Amino acid sequence: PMPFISAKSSPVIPLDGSVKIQCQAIREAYLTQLMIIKNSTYREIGRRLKFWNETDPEFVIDHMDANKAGRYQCQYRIGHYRFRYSDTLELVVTGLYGKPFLSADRGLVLMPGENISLTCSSAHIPFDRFSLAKEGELSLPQHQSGEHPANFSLGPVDLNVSGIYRCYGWYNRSPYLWSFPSNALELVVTAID
């Protein structure tokens, strides 16, 4: 098990936003610094916070841009020149490409168990892949699709599927750089009808 590396704010940060990262404390570390990976090379980044309301080291990265998007790890210097790292965290920056369009082939309100797929298009920008995000959620959108027609299925829906959804740009060359959110699309599952 590797030291955890959570993100207090969403891992999805708008163009010039700012995010707060937290690493797992390691009693034997003389120094702990947030590192960002770039071409198999660890680079110092972000800023350390002060001791209060929490123990595990917290950092903060502001003025988000392409350069700050990507994989992150925590570097624990457990000696003059001996280190160990936390698990990996990914941060994506949004607002680098025009917004795509999200829609559905059904009715936005539906009985549980029903099936529905959301489609995310882009009649201009040849996005390599697409990612669907559920607004409320505190994390990183993992539900993606490479299909050009862009199909996001949700199999048998349950009351938990309800909520507002948005879709993003996304390019293979530059994976951690997404477009501006697409139009939002609300769904509501209810067994009452």
Ligand X SMILES: *[C@H]1O[C@H](CO)[C@@H](O[C@@H]2O[C@H](CO)[C@@H](O)[C@H](O)[C@H]2NC(C)=O)[C@H](O)[C@H]1NC(C)=O
Question: Does residue 35 contact residue 73 with C-beta atoms inside 8 Å?
Answer: yes
156 touches, from ligand X, ligand NAG, none (C-beta below 5 to 8 Å by class) = ligand NAG
113 touches, from ligand X, ligand NAG, none (C-beta below 5 to 8 Å by class) = ligand NAG
Which of 106/148 has CB closer to ligand NAG?
106
Which of 1/149 has CB closer to ligand X?
149
Give the number of other Cβ atoms within 10 Å of residue 101's Cβ. 14
Question: Closest by alpha carbon to 51, among 69, 73, 25, 78?
Answer: 25
- For 51-81, b/e burial (b = at least 16 CB within 10 A) is eeeeeebbbbbeebeeebbbebbbbbbeeee
Residue 115 within binding range of ligand NAG, rule CB under 6 A: yes
Residues 6+ apart with CB under 8 A from 184: 102, 135, 164, 165, 166
Question: Does residue 144 contact residue 120 with C-beta atoms inside 8 Å?
Answer: no
**Considering only residues 87-116, where is the footprint of ligand X by CB under 6 A?**
105
Choose, by CB under 6 A, the member of 39, 142, 156, 193 that binds ligand NAG. 156
Residues 6+ apart with CB under 8 A from 122: 98, 100, 101, 169
117 touches, from ligand NAG, ligand X, none (C-beta below 5 to 8 Å by class) = ligand X
Choose, by CB under 6 A, the member of 18, 151, 162, 174 that binds ligand X. 151
105 touches, from ligand X, ligand NAG, none (C-beta below 5 to 8 Å by class) = ligand X
Instruction: Give 144's Cβ-side CA count (13 Å radius).
Output: 16
Choose, by CB under 6 A, the member of 153, 159, 188, 191 that binds ligand X. 153
Q: How far is the CB of 151 from ligand X (least distance, A)?
A: 3
Residue 6 within binding range of ligand X, rule CB under 6 A: no
Which of 6/117 has CB closer to ligand X?
117
Residues 6+ apart with CB under 8 A from 33: 44, 46, 48, 74, 75, 77
151 touches, from ligand X, ligand NAG, none (C-beta below 5 to 8 Å by class) = ligand X
Interface with ligand X by CB under 6 A: which residues? 105, 117, 151, 153
